[PDB]
C-alpha cells in the first residue's frame, strides 16, 4: 500500500531524513531531494534497483503524498506531467 510506505517515510529513523529546511522567511517542512527517496527505498525491502524505486516514488507524488519544491519540478508538472517525480538533486521534494 502506498499509504503504508509513505507513513514509514514519515517515521523517525526508519523513514527518510526528516530535516527542517529553512531559508529566509519560509520553513520547508522536511525538504529533501528526488534522488534521496530513491536511495532510501532501494536501501529498504521495497525496491532493489534505482529504476524500481524511481517508479514507486513516482506514484507517491502522483497521489499527492509529496510536495514539489523549486522552479524545476514546478516546470515539470506545468506542461507534460508524464514524469512528475524527478530523480535529480536540483529538484526538491518536501512533506
From Swiss-Prot:
Section of the entire sequence shown: 125 to 219 of 350
Protein's job: Major protein kinase C substrate of platelets.
Protein name per Swiss-Prot or TrEMBL: Pleckstrin
Organism from which the protein derives: Homo sapiens (Human)
Residue stretches making up the DEP domain: 12-95
Amino acid at each position: 500500500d502506498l499509504g503504508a510506505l509513505y507513513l514509514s517515510m514519515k517515521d523517525t529513523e526508519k523513514g527518510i531524513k526528516e530535516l527542517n529546511l529553512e531559508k529566509d522567511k519560509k520553513i520547508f517542512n522536511h525538504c529533501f531531494t528526488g534522488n534521496c527517496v530513491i536511495d532510501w527505498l532501494v536501501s529498504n525491502q521495497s525496491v532493489r534497483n534505482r529504476q524500481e524505486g524511481l517508479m514507486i516514488a513516482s506514484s507517491l507524488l502522483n497521489e499527492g503524498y509529496l510536495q514539489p519544491a523549486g522552479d524545476m519540478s514546478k516546470s515539470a508538472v506545468d506542461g507534460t506531467a508524464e514524469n512528475p517525480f524527478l530523480d535529480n538533486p536540483d529538484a526538491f521534494y518536501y512533506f
